[PDB]
Design an enzyme around this catalytic site. Structure first.
Site, mmCIF file in Angstrom:
data_model
loop_
_atom_site.group_PDB
_atom_site.id
_atom_site.type_symbol
_atom_site.label_atom_id
_atom_site.label_comp_id
_atom_site.label_asym_id
_atom_site.label_seq_id
_atom_site.Cartn_x
_atom_site.Cartn_y
_atom_site.Cartn_z
ATOM 1 C CB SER A 120 -0.896 -0.001 1.195
ATOM 2 O OG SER A 120 -1.876 -1.003 1.077
ATOM 3 C CD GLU B 210 -1.910 8.543 -5.151
ATOM 4 O OE1 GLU B 210 -1.685 7.353 -5.547
ATOM 5 O OE2 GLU B 210 -3.046 9.054 -4.957
ATOM 6 C CG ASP C 34 -7.918 8.502 -10.741
ATOM 7 O OD1 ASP C 34 -8.780 7.544 -10.772
ATOM 8 O OD2 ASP C 34 -6.942 8.581 -9.957
ATOM 9 C CE1 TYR D 165 -3.957 -3.555 -1.622
ATOM 10 C CE2 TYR D 165 -5.588 -4.763 -0.343
ATOM 11 C CZ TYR D 165 -4.947 -3.572 -0.656
ATOM 12 O OH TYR D 165 -5.328 -2.411 -0.047
HETATM 13 N N1 LIG Z 1 -13.672 1.713 -8.683
HETATM 14 C C1 LIG Z 1 -12.512 2.160 -8.192
HETATM 15 N N2 LIG Z 1 -12.290 2.090 -6.854
HETATM 16 C C2 LIG Z 1 -11.114 2.533 -6.384
HETATM 17 N N3 LIG Z 1 -10.098 3.096 -7.043
HETATM 18 C C3 LIG Z 1 -10.349 3.143 -8.364
HETATM 19 C C4 LIG Z 1 -11.489 2.695 -8.997
HETATM 20 N N4 LIG Z 1 -11.405 2.942 -10.366
HETATM 21 C C5 LIG Z 1 -10.221 3.488 -10.542
HETATM 22 N N5 LIG Z 1 -9.543 3.655 -9.354
HETATM 23 C C6 LIG Z 1 -8.229 4.269 -9.172
HETATM 24 O O1 LIG Z 1 -7.327 3.315 -8.664
HETATM 25 C C7 LIG Z 1 -6.287 4.014 -7.917
HETATM 26 C C8 LIG Z 1 -6.131 3.357 -6.569
HETATM 27 O O2 LIG Z 1 -5.297 4.159 -5.718
HETATM 28 P P1 LIG Z 1 -4.436 3.274 -4.727
HETATM 29 O O3 LIG Z 1 -3.671 4.102 -3.742
HETATM 30 O O4 LIG Z 1 -3.627 2.276 -5.525
HETATM 31 O O5 LIG Z 1 -5.703 2.520 -3.938
HETATM 32 P P2 LIG Z 1 -6.008 2.111 -2.415
HETATM 33 O O6 LIG Z 1 -7.479 1.970 -2.188
HETATM 34 O O7 LIG Z 1 -5.349 3.105 -1.470
HETATM 35 N N6 LIG Z 1 -5.299 0.695 -2.210
HETATM 36 P P3 LIG Z 1 -3.734 0.367 -1.964
HETATM 37 O O8 LIG Z 1 -2.809 1.546 -2.070
HETATM 38 O O9 LIG Z 1 -3.221 -0.671 -2.945
HETATM 39 O O10 LIG Z 1 -3.643 -0.253 -0.629
HETATM 40 C C9 LIG Z 1 -6.704 5.496 -7.920
HETATM 41 O O11 LIG Z 1 -6.039 6.170 -8.980
HETATM 42 C C10 LIG Z 1 -8.215 5.343 -8.093
HETATM 43 O O12 LIG Z 1 -8.997 6.466 -8.432
HETATM 44 C C1 LIG Z 2 -3.764 8.021 -8.223
HETATM 45 N N1 LIG Z 2 -3.620 6.611 -8.000
HETATM 46 C C2 LIG Z 2 -2.330 5.994 -8.393
HETATM 47 C C3 LIG Z 2 -2.120 5.981 -9.912
HETATM 48 O O1 LIG Z 2 -3.254 5.349 -10.489
HETATM 49 C C4 LIG Z 2 -0.879 5.226 -10.243
HETATM 50 N N2 LIG Z 2 -0.602 5.046 -11.655
HETATM 51 C C5 LIG Z 2 -0.685 6.177 -12.602
HETATM 52 C C6 LIG Z 2 -0.854 3.841 -9.570
HETATM 53 O O2 LIG Z 2 0.358 3.190 -9.924
HETATM 54 C C7 LIG Z 2 0.484 1.930 -9.232
HETATM 55 O O3 LIG Z 2 -0.476 0.963 -9.603
HETATM 56 C C8 LIG Z 2 0.324 2.118 -7.704
HETATM 57 O O4 LIG Z 2 -0.950 2.762 -7.427
HETATM 58 C C9 LIG Z 2 -0.957 3.985 -8.071
HETATM 59 C C10 LIG Z 2 -2.299 4.666 -7.770
HETATM 60 O O5 LIG Z 2 -2.453 4.800 -6.320
HETATM 61 O O6 LIG Z 2 1.409 2.943 -7.275
HETATM 62 C C11 LIG Z 2 2.659 2.299 -7.433
HETATM 63 C C12 LIG Z 2 3.752 3.164 -6.781
HETATM 64 C C13 LIG Z 2 2.919 2.197 -8.884
HETATM 65 C C14 LIG Z 2 1.854 1.378 -9.599
HETATM 66 O O7 LIG Z 2 2.101 1.393 -10.977
HETATM 67 O O8 LIG Z 2 1.925 0.003 -9.234
HETATM 68 MG MG LIG Z 3 -2.571 5.839 -4.394
#
Ligand SMILES: Nc1ncnc2c1ncn2[C@@H]1O[C@H](COP(=O)(O)OP(=O)(O)NP(=O)(O)O)[C@@H](O)[C@H]1O
Ligand SMILES: CN[C@@H]1[C@H](O)[C@H](NC)[C@H]2O[C@]3(O)[C@H](O[C@@H]2[C@H]1O)O[C@H](C)CC3(O)O
Ligand SMILES: [Mg+2]
Ligand SMILES: [Mg+2]
Length: 258
Positions: free
Chosen positions: A42, A83, A126, A227
């Site tokens: 994460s 991020e 997004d 995950y």
């Molecule tokens: N239906 C959706 N639900 C959640 N995220 C989505 C969805 N569709 C697209 N996204 C995008 O997927 C990305 C997820 O951000 P990320 O930080 O990877 O998710 P998270 O919920 O914090 N899980 P993680 O960081 O893996 O523990 C963002 O850019 C979201 O807007």
């Molecule tokens: C705003 N959300 C993020 C963007 O979608 C971003 N890619 C453009 C995502 O990239 C990733 O999937 C992950 O989650 C990132 C997301 O949290 O962030 C990692 C550092 C890189 C990744 O490539 O594995």
């Molecule tokens: Mg993120």
């Protein structure tokens, strides 16, 4: 990463404050830190609201400094990927789709940043998804609650942003680097298109897995396990199984009506 997150969180907010204190409206922690809980891979998701756009030099200072607070996934037992998304008050309030994103920092940029490429402001579809997540589950580390600051994102804007995101993934190079997250993101998009709700990656994965023909259940089960840090991520191994999953799930998403 299994380390307590408060140290790195305070470092990142210190960088944000150092550059932006005089134009800062809010800092919101959101994403899995608030909704489902951080898992080994994460990131730390921060949403920053400023009252005015950044000078170019301030963009570069902040981006450079944030990179020093952050670690490439799998390169640190103590530092998570950071991020930071910056929105300008008048760009996102009132809510309009699509909205302008002032700045985004993340580890996917590391190479670019080290070569002196600083990503400028852009339309970001997004934001419809990020602001829906932040309004439902976030911590105001400074300023008002996301619920109060941000207009509701209409469900039709959410629905459109979910369907438009699918345009990113047509062939295997489009998900080459990021196989686990594209799979889990397809399940989340499918979940959200049917339910209107947002779920953590593992909850969306288990939902998807219930609703798939048995042939497609293995790839999402492997992604859900990776995950949670329980199994290895060997999704790149089974390239053909991955592309069939992607095409199958995209088609099933496309079937879901507004
Ligand atoms: N239906 C959706 N639900 C959640 N995220 C989505 C969805 N569709 C697209 N996204 C995008 O997927 C990305 C997820 O951000 P990320 O930080 O990877 O998710 P998270 O919920 O914090 N899980 P993680 O960081 O893996 O523990 C963002 O850019 C979201 O807007
Ligand atoms: C705003 N959300 C993020 C963007 O979608 C971003 N890619 C453009 C995502 O990239 C990733 O999937 C992950 O989650 C990132 C997301 O949290 O962030 C990692 C550092 C890189 C990744 O490539 O594995
Ligand atoms: Mg993120
Ligand atoms: Mg996250």
């Amino acid at each position: 990463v299994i380390a307590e997150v408060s140290t790195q969180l305070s470092e990142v907010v210190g960088v944000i404050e150092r550059h932006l204190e005089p134009t800062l409206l809010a800092v919101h922690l959101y994403g899995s830190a608030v909704d489902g809980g951080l898992k080994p891979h994460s990131d730390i998701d921060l949403l920053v609201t400023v009252t005015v756009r950044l000078d170019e030099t301030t963009r570069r200072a902040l981006i450079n400094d944030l990179l020093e607070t952050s670690a490439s996934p799998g390169e640190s037992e103590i530092l998570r990927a950071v991020e930071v998304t910056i929105v300008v008050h008048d760009d996102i309030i009132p809510w309009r789709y699509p909205a302008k994103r002032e700045l985004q920092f993340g580890e996917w940029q590391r190479n670019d940043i080290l070569a002196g490429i600083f990503e400028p402001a852009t339309i970001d579809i997004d934001l419809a998804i990020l602001l829906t997540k932040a309004r439902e589950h976030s911590v105001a580390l400074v300023g008002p609650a996301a619920e109060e600051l941000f207009d509701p994102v209409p469900e039709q804007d959410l629905f459109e942003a979910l369907n438009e995101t699918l345009t990113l993934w047509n062939s295997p190079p489009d998900w080459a680097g990021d196989d686990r997250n594209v799979v889990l993101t397809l399940s989340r998009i499918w979940y959200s298109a049917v339910t209107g709700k947002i779920a953590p990656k593992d909850v969306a994965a288990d939902w998807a897995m219930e609703r798939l023909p048995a042939q497609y259940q293995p790839v999402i089960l492997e992604a859900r396990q990776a995950y949670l840090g329980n199994e290895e991520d060997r999704l790149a191994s089974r390239a053909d199984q991955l592309e069939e999953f992607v095409h199958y799930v995209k088609g099933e998403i496309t079937k879901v009506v507004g």
